[model samples]
Target: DNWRYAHEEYEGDVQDVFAQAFKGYVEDNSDHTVQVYRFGELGIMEQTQNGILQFVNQSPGFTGSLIPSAQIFFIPYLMPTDMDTVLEFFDESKAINEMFPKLYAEHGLELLKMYPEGEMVVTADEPITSPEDFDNKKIRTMTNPLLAETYKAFGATPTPLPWGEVYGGLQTGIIDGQENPIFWIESGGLYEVSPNLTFTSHGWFTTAMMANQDFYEGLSEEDQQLVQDAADAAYDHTIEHIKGLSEESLEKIKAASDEVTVTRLNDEQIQAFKERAPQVEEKFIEMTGEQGQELLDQFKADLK
Candidate 1:
């Protein structure tokens, strides 16, 4: 069978990871060819569920409505900011491999892999030393309810603006700040506009790879095994590839712009942000109920 995968964006490492798996499949089986498309072409998670597309890449922030438990990643401060610790946890975490698959299966998806991009850094008009410093600042956020609660919990007004408009929004004062991994700031040239960098080390941005359950079920037992292994290989390759990229991206931003100022929040400053996180955790349980609570508890156990 010819395979197809859909990604939400034009080009990036997330899609790069997907390509790694597809490339492996092509090498393994010359019979099965692959087609690649962006988000709007094949619809999204739901369309994948309909078996209209075989695979899709979606950020948990965007999948909140369909997979309530998947929003677990968007809740800030629950995960370690250090990439090494986070990587091992993701690779072997019971919540990820054991619990999350069950969650995806319920939604008619075969959970292939979930991986981190980088530690999220806030680039704002002014350095955010404390949560109070976020007062009245409009921080661009995804429409995810959990993410909205996250920025709100951080004491910033969470504003929804399309990714295409963020640069213009920051430049025109339509929004005061935004958060992303430092790599994105440099690539998007956002540092030139939002010169103040605040590293709260709250969480890393994450995304998942999934396939339509019907399509996955149609695969031979051996092909299913191959696909899963390929996904794992891609995940390992990506985590290694991303190592030190955040620091490199930040350094490049600084080198490129004289106006860039970075504020790596001290523990005491981070503690203030951490204090607001309990409300978000509570929100997660409220949204996901018993199932989410169980998944979250398993995640913490795995984290420990």
Candidate 2:
């Protein structure tokens, strides 16, 4: 009668987009009612791990500790920051469509779909005109070490903090800035406190929709196919939903408050940050060893 679903993000965000996008399709096609859970409502990973929660959403960066290769998204400049290019790769990349499912299966999870939310933008207390503007700033990163490395390369001190503390920290000077997809910055109200928005275009926030492998396997064969098709349909719906999404969110953020200032880095200005990316890529291989190297290679080749 009820199948529980959850994500680490709050309502009205991209994760919720997937949840809503698929909820109707699954409910209409099968007996599953698709009970939804938000960020703080339940223990998402643990419950999902042992089958109490059937469907869940997670950022690829958030899973790096358990699955190091998933942090391939953390490699700055690795993903083409443009939406069209990213959608193209998500559509056909061997690393995504082929390799990633196997990676998830090894850990007893079913990777239903992977989608890009939007490009990562950093909001700071001051205008960012050059790399020097990042100096002495503490940017809040997720608990990913390579993400820490990426911030360090950009000349900022990367402070790892739980998302629960980000808004307060950014306001109280504990963190000078933070990075997230633009819509997420709006969702969390991060831009209000850190009013200077810099569009570095270094990377995009990537999320995965997953189901507990055991729970999925227990489903009737027809239901399993229904769930699979539902995820694919949600991915399509999400793609259309995201087109022009960032700019739309930008309008809303600006309309809500006058304190926000958006800065888009020119090609030359973005180069200093992009140039530091290879070292982060190398660090990934160092952290994950040969397996990371193989996925990294396949990821790049698939994009071509």
Candidate 3:
């Protein structure tokens, strides 16, 4: 339900691609049934670690979870501002397409494919143009230390909060702002409370579609290929879907609310935020080690 018009004409979006995959699986293997569960329907939030473990551990109740490395994409201003460059990084980034899968496998999850949710922007009660603009402002960040560090580096006070509390936090002044895709801001009705949208171009909201390793391995080779094909299709389609949605959602929000303000940072302004967090890159290298460094190196090389 997160998506309203997040798909292209020929290529299906995330749902359409996955639905096609599920359809193919059922058609190819009549002996087994394929079940699909949307987020929260099974009481699991696919974004959290605990929720992910339900599927990774194949616990009595959960489905599959997204990988933690997905957070790497959220490293502030580390990616190209252009969607084509970003997609190229995803398509050819060794760290993403290769190293990440192996890393997830070590933890008992199969990373199906990764796609962007949308361009991440900071939605706040006031306009933000520079690092100093964030000073003393409390910005909502996910539980990840890197994300917290990203905001901290920007001179803001990073307030870690759960998703459920975000709206309330912003509405009640617990937090001054939060970062998410434009569609998320529109979908969550956040524009009503915090209507100032800043296009920091920090990064895209990227996530990996995953499956239980045991469940994936148990499938025959052909079935596994079918699943991979579906994930690949979703990956291709969602790339286009999200790129379009990033701008379109902002337009929708503007049309709906007179209070909403959209700001796109100039190159100089974006660089100011990027330069503030030099240590973030080192911290990433330290946390992810050589494999991550290689990926980061490749990402930089590919961007040029």
Candidate 4:
């Protein structure tokens, strides 16, 4: 009767979508005994994890970025392709060995659906068609190594800030720009501060819904199946949610900002980005060492 979930930022539709679909699945099936409990709206993912770990609460909707620290994989241009490549990394066994286990028995966490969430559009003060434009601009960033490094490479003074502070950060000029899914900007109220939206379409994004290891493992097999089944339903719903919601969010973004300009990166601009891929890959290898390269190679082979 106790299943807890927390989110740092609130998105009404996304949350409701997950909640309703999950509720329906549980009710319709009627075999599952657990009840859903929506708990306190918390701070950033790391803070939430800290609280959950101590309090023995379980959160099913946290991204992998929360583990150790945020990773650079969430940023634009970090990932190049779609499902074919992305699926290999999430095959459970492959991921456990290659990537840090945020949600596993070894690490006390689990994740579901790290698929592409489309490209994040850059909303900056200036036209940001190229990486050069990020120079000297203080952009909002996460507490991840790769993100800070990527922004540094792009010539920006990266400011590691939480999602909660983003709107005020932009309004007060603490940061010049922020990157996110258009829906997120609108939901998080960041669009109010930074109205200028640009479409770089740098790369696809991946996220996850995780649960605590002890809680999940302690469950009876029947209960465990219930939770996993709920996760599967929620993941499917999220994919379906984005399929239509992204377009809706885009329209909303356009309608909300008169001054917002969408700068679509042309082939040359995209090519310029591709050329830098090897360097980032090299850096990733240096940062993650052999494990990173193995994952990358396996992912590439899976894609092919």
Candidates' TM-scores? Answer: 0.91, 0.88, 0.77, 0.71
* Residue-wise C-alpha lDDT for candidate 2, range 113-154, written one tens digit per residue: 999877888899998877788899999976777888888888
In model 4, how large is the Cα lDDT of residue 139? 84
lDDT of each: 0.81, 0.85, 0.66, 0.57
Instruction: By lDDT, rank the candidates, best first.
Output: 2, 1, 3, 4
When summed lDDT is taken over every stretch of 10 residues in candidate 1, the lowest stretch is: 11-20
Candidate 3 similarity to native, TM-score: 0.77
Give one digit per residue, the lDDT tens place, for model 3 in 47-139.
223323322111101122233333456467666786677777778877667776786776666667766556777999999899899999999
Clashes of each: 0, 0, 0, 3
Best by TM-score: 1
Q: What is the per-residue lDDT of model 4 for residues 15-91, given as tens digits with 9 covering 90 to 100?
A: 44565566567667765433333445432344324435311222221333333222335334544433344434345
How do these models rank on TM-score, best leading?
Answer: 1, 2, 3, 4
Query: Cα lDDT of model 4 overall?
Result: 0.57
Candidate 1 lDDT score relative to the true structure:
0.81
Model 3 poorest 10 in a row by lDDT: 1-10
Predicted structure with the largest lDDT when compared to the true one: 2
